[PDB]
Amino acid sequence: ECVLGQSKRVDFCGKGYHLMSFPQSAPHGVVFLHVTYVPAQEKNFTTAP
Amino acid sequence: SRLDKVEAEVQIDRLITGRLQSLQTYVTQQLIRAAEIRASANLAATKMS
Numbered sequence: 001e002c003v004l005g006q007s008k009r010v011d012f013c014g015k016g017y018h019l020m021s022f023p024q025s026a027p028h029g030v031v032f033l034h035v036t037y038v039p040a041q042e043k044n045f046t047t048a049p
Numbered sequence: 050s051r052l053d054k055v056e057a058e059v060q061i062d063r064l065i066t067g068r069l070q071s072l073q074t075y076v077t078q079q080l081i082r083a084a085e086i087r088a089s090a091n092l093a094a095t096k097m098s
């Protein structure tokens with residue numbers, strides 16, 4: 001769900017909006033490099049429905 | 050109170066073996082219950098996110 005696709009599940013693959021992941025092999029395990037999109041530099045606006 | 054230190058060991062070793070087995074049974078069942086509690090806690094951490 002994260003190397004073979006893009007997941008919409010929140011915090012399943014990294015903190016942020018998941019873009020993609022890269023698997024790396026570790027001894028007796030696996031390491032995922034989760035690439036996410038994190039919004040930055042917010043600014044206040046007035047809004048309306 | 051009834052037996053001397055050589056006849057008492059025959060009985061005390063029986064008691065020790067039995068009580069150690071009681072503790073072992075308790076700990077084994079606590080591990081098996083902790084696995085299920087951890088599955089439930091992982092599900093709750095997934096539902097939170």
Ligand SMILES: *[C@@H]1O[C@H](CO)[C@@H](O[C@@H]2O[C@H](CO)[C@@H](O)[C@H](O)[C@H]2NC(C)=O)[C@H](O)[C@H]1NC(C)=O
Pocket residue numbers: 042043044
């Ligand atoms: C969006 O507006 C709020 C409200 O003005 C800003 O929050 C205040 O920031 C000031 C510092 O400049 C604090 O002293 C206040 O306590 C904050 N809150 C409130 C309730 O007034 C907030 O900084 C603005 N956000 C952006 C990104 O501009």
